[PDB]
Every structure is written in C-alpha cells, then in structure tokens.
A paper describes a structure:
N contains an N-terminal domain, involved in RNA binding, and a C-terminal (NCTD) involved in RNA binding, protein dimerization, and interaction with the viral membrane protein (M). The SARS-CoV-2 NCTD folds into a helical core with a protruding β-hairpin employed for protein dimerization. Here we report the crystal structure of the C-terminal domain (NCTD) in open and closed conformations and in complex with guanine triphosphate, GTP.
The structure of the binary complex NCTD-GTP was solved in two different space groups, P21 and P1, to a resolution of 1.8 and 2 Å, respectively. Both crystal forms contain two protein dimers in the asymmetric unit. However, in the space group P21 there is one molecule of GTP bound to one of the dimers, whereas in the P1 the asymmetric unit contains two molecules of GTP, each bound to one dimer. The electron density map is well defined for the three GTP molecules, which present temperature factors that increase from the guanine moiety to the phosphates, suggesting that the guanine is well anchored to the protein and the phosphates are more flexible. In the two crystal forms the GTP binds to a cleft between the two subunits of the dimer, and adjacent to the β-hairpin in the closed conformation. One side of the guanine ring establishes a π–π T-shaped interaction (edge-to-face) with the indole ring of W330 and hydrophobic interactions with K338. The other side of the guanine ring stacks over the guanidinium group of R259, which makes hydrogen bonds with the OH– groups of the ribose ring. At the bottom of the cleft the guanine moiety interacts with the M317 and with the main chain of the residues K338 and A336. These interactions suggest high specificity for guanine, as other nitrogen bases have not as many favorable interactions as the guanine. Importantly, the C-terminal tail of the symmetry-related dimer also contributes to the GTP binding, covering the cleft as a lid, with Van der Waals and hydrophobic interactions between T362´ and the ribose and with the π–π stacking between P364´ and W330.
Author numbering:
A (entry chain B): 242 to 364
B (entry chain A): 254 to 364
Write the structure that this text describes.
C-alpha cells in the first residue's frame, strides 16, 4: 500500500504531464509539483506532512472534497492562454465556496488554513 | 446531478454548463470558457477529451496552484490560481491552440 521513493519509480512518475501527476509517499509534492513558495505560479499549499505524503496523507479526502472535477474546472474558472518565451500556458483562476451550514465547516477551514503558506515556517 | 457541491458537478446534455456553473461572462466569480455547443453539451461535447486533458488531478490542483482563503459577505471561499504548460512538442499542439481559442471568452460573440 505504501512505497518509498527511488530514482527509478520517480523517473516513471515524472513522465506524466504535470497537471495529471499524483503525489504519494513515493513521489512527494516537491518531486511532482516543485518546492512550495511565494512566487507567481509556484504552489503554496502543504505543511511538512502533506508535502511528504501527498495523496497518502491521512486527511487527504477532506482536502480532495474541494478539488474540482474536469467539468467544474473548465466551468467555474477564468481561463486564459498566454504565449511567452517559455511556451504556451493555460492560465486559470477561480474560487470555491465552502458550505458554512455543514457542521464540519469550522474543521474544514482549520484544515485548509493549516496547509496554506505553511512552507514559511520550515526550510 | 445538482445535488453535488458545485466543484464536483459534471455538465452533460441533461445538466448543461449554464445549469451547473452559471452563465458565461466577464466578472470574477463567473466562468468564461465555452462556446454555445460546449455549453449545451458539457462532457458530451465531441472534443471534450481534448479539453479535459488540461484539467488538473486533485493532487495537481492542490500541488500546482496558489491557494488562498477569503471571508467575504457571501461566504468563505477557497481561492485558486495557476498555469498549466501546453506540450509544444505534441503533434496535436496546433489543434489544441485552435480548440482553446474557440472556447475562451466565446460568450462575447453569442447573439
């Protein structure tokens, strides 16, 4: 059920297009999506545990409930296309509303805030 | 179909893009993507798979994006922004550019 990263398995995982990668303990968030940080187009989400575990994180389902389906991604978002010296890029922005009538709402807010910009508190 | 929270809905002919995700338009909380055909068909659209190849996995959505939380008078919102690179070595790259051009801000020309 759980694997360790090897250069071998990392080289296979990395063949997927970025947007279709799945981070796991064997191919962690940093490996799949780059170091967390403040820059534009750099990811900022994940504390040390989530970074190391990806979708093996024990509370992953409570984060994943907020990730959009392909239909909703293209349906909800503002989509743009930019051509630059690095290539052609599909840009996306949007927002997903949390349901504040869910009795779990306060816990959802706390879990999301725990990972947003967590990288600032560790190397 | 509409029982699902917004972000988990799947548009089809039976429950189309406007029904699931609202009218296309310019404001920040609206979507801007899809011509009249995609809007009416959703994931039944004939070229849906060629669009869907750019949508992120759940892991990639939380891994690539800049994620925020904003409390506004309407509610608490999980904000997201990012960019996905097209593979310009893919022999289908030209067609992908054409396909995306057809749907981005297509609403601007609707009667």
């Amino acid at each position: 059920l759980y694997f360790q990263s090897t250069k071998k398995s990392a080289a296979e995982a990395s063949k997927k297009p970025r947007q279709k990668r799945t981070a796991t303990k064997a191919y962690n968030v940093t490996q799949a999506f780059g170091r967390r940080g403040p820059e534009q187009t750099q990811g900022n989400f994940g504390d040390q545990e989530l970074i190391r575990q990806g979708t093996d994180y024990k509370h992953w389902p409570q984060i994943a409930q907020f990730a959009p389906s392909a239909s909703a991604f293209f349906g909800m978002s503002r989509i743009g296309m930019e051509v630059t010296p690095s290539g052609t890029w599909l840009t996306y922005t949007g927002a997903i509303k949390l349901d504040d009538k869910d009795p779990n709402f306060k816990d959802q807010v706390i879990l999301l805030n725990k990972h947003i910009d967590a990288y600032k508190t560790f190397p």
